[PDB]
Amino acid sequence: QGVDPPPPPGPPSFTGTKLVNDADHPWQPLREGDIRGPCPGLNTLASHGYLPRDGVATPAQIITATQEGFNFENNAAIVATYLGHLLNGNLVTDLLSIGGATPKTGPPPPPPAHAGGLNVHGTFEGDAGMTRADEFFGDNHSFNQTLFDKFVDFSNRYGGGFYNLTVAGELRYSRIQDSIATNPEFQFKNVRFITAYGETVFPINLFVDGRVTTDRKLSMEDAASIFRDMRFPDDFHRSAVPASNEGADQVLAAHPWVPGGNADNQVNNYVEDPDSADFTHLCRLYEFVVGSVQELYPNPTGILRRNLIKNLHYWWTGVNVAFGGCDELFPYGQL
C-alpha cells in the first residue's frame, strides 16, 4: 500500500578522506535484473555495494551512498536525488531505478507518471554528455567508446594526457557543437543546461583521489575504470572535503553559452531560450520542475499525494540553500 518517506540524511559525521574501495565494498559483476544507467557515480556505488547491487534504492540510500562513497556534499546530494526521484521514481514505494524500467520499483504510478528511472529523457537526463550519446541516436545510458576516445583526445590536447578543469571547459563546448551539428532534437535548456556544467567537474572533484591535494587531474585509466567499468580505482580514497560542482563557473566562462536548442527538427539551427533557467536565474529551474511534476501528477490523492508533498518539501530544503533562496511552492497544498 506504501511507505512513509523519511527526511533526507544530513552530512556524514566524518567528512575527511578515507579508503572507499575496501573489503566490505568489493566490485562485483552484474547479475540478471541488475540495473545500471547514465550516472557513473551511482553505477560505481551500486557495483561496489554502497547502493543495493540491483541498482534500485531509496532517496535516503542514494544520499548516504554518494556521501560515504565520494563525499558528495549533502545539499547537492539532496538536490540531485529528489529531482531524480520526483521525476523518475516511485513515490509510493519510495524507490528509484538508477537506470531504466524495472518491476523492482513496485506497482507503477498513474500515467503520465512512469517511475521509469534516470534513463528517462527530456526533463532530467539530456544531451551533450561526456561518455553517453544523445537519446536521439538510440542509447542515452550506455558507455560509448567513441565519446570516451574524444575525452582522451581532449585530455591529451589540453591537460597533458589528464582530465583537468581546462579540458572540461574545452570538452563541454565541443560536445555542444557535436550535438548542434548532428542532433536535430538537440535541447540544452532548463535542468540540462545547469547539470551539464556540474557533470564536467565531478570527475575532477570526486573521481580524483582525495590524497591528491594539488594539481587535481584524472588519469585516463581511472576515468575508464569508473565511466566504463563502474569500478573504483585500486585503493581509491574519496575527496578530503564534501564537494560537488566547484569550478563549473570557470567551465562556462571558458566558452560562454546560452540555454536553447535546435529548432524545427533541423541541425545547425540553435535558437536561444530566454525563459530557461541559467546560472543567474536558478529559481526558474525549481519552478520548471514543480511544473513538470504537476504534469506527471495532475490530480493525486491518498498516500501518493502525501508522499508527493513530503518529497517536494525535502527537495525544496536542498534547493533553498543551493539556489540561494527560492519561494517554496505548494501545488498540492499541505499535509
Ligand SMILES: *[C@@H]1O[C@H](CO)[C@@H](O[C@@H]2O[C@H](CO)[C@@H](O[C@@H]3O[C@H](CO[C@H]4O[C@H](CO[C@H]5O[C@H](CO)[C@@H](O)[C@H](O)[C@@H]5O)[C@@H](O)[C@H](O[C@H]5O[C@H](CO)[C@@H](O)[C@H](O)[C@@H]5O)[C@@H]4O)[C@@H](O)[C@H](O[C@H]4O[C@H](CO)[C@@H](O)[C@H](O)[C@@H]4O)[C@@H]3O)[C@H](O)[C@H]2NC(C)=O)[C@H](O)[C@H]1NC(C)=O
Ligand atoms: C591542465 O593541464 C595542463 C597541462 O598540464 C595545464 O597547463 C599548464 O598551464 C600553465 C598555465 O595555465 C602553463 O604555465 C604557463 O605557461 C605560460 C605560457 O608559456 C609559454 O610562453 C611563456 C612566455 O614567454 C614570454 O617570453 C618570450 C621570450 O622568451 C616572448 O617571446 C613571449 O612573448 C612572452 O612574453 C614562456 O615563458 C614559456 O617558455 C618557457 O617554458 C617552456 C615550457 O612550457 C619552455 O619550453 C621554454 O623554453 C621556456 O622555459 C612558454 O613557451 C607562461 O606564460 C606562464 O608563465 C607564468 O608562470 C611563471 C612560472 O610560475 C611566472 O614566473 C610568470 O610570471 C608567468 O606569469 C606559465 O609558465 C603550463 O605550461 C601548462 N602546461 C602545459 C604542458 O601545457 C593546465 O594549467 C591545467 N589546468 C588546470 C586548471 O590545472
Ligand SMILES: *[C@@H]1O[C@H](CO)[C@@H](O[C@@H]2O[C@H](CO)[C@@H](O[C@@H]3O[C@H](CO[C@H]4O[C@H](CO)[C@@H](O)[C@H](O)[C@@H]4O)[C@@H](O)[C@H](O[C@H]4O[C@H](CO)[C@@H](O)[C@H](O)[C@@H]4O)[C@@H]3O)[C@H](O)[C@H]2NC(C)=O)[C@H](O)[C@H]1NC(C)=O
Ligand atoms: C556513440 O556516440 C557517437 C557520437 O554521438 C555516435 O555516432 C554519431 O552518429 C551520428 C548518427 O549516426 C552521426 O551523425 C551523422 O553525421 C553525418 C555527417 O557528420 C559528419 O560530421 C561530423 C563532425 O561534425 C563527423 O564527426 C562525422 O564523421 C561526419 O563526417 C550526417 O550526414 C547525419 O545527418 C543526417 O541525418 C540526420 C538524422 O535525421 C538529419 O537530421 C541530417 O539532416 C542528415 O540528413 C548524422 O547527423 C555522428 O557524426 C556520429 N558521431 C561520431 C563522432 O562518430 C555513435 O552512434 C555511438 N556509438 C554506438 C556504437 O552506439
Ligand code: HEM
Ligand atoms: C546524488 C544523486 C545523483 C543523481 C540522481 C545523478 C543523476 C545523474 C543523471 C541523470 C545523469 C545523466 C545526465 C544526462 O544525461 O543528462 C548523471 C550524469 C553524471 N553523474 Fe550523476 N547523479 C547523482 C550523483 C552523482 C555523483 C555523486 C557523481 C560523482 C561521483 C556523479 C557523477 C556524474 C557524472 C560524471 C555524470 C556525467 C556522465 C557523462 O556525461 O558521461 N553523479 N547523473
Ligand SMILES: CC(=O)/C=C/[C@@H]1C(C)=CCCC1(C)C
Ligand atoms: C540542479 C542540480 O542538479 C544542481 C544544481 C547546482 C547546485 C546544486 C549548486 C550551484 C549550481 C547549481 C545550481 C547548478
Ligand SMILES: CC(=O)/C=C/[C@H]1C(C)=CCCC1(C)C
Ligand atoms: C551540482 C551541479 O552543478 C549539478 C549536478 C548534477 C549533475 C551534474 C549530475 C548528477 C548530479 C546533479 C543532478 C546534481
Ligand SMILES: [Mg+2]
Ligand atoms: Mg546524457
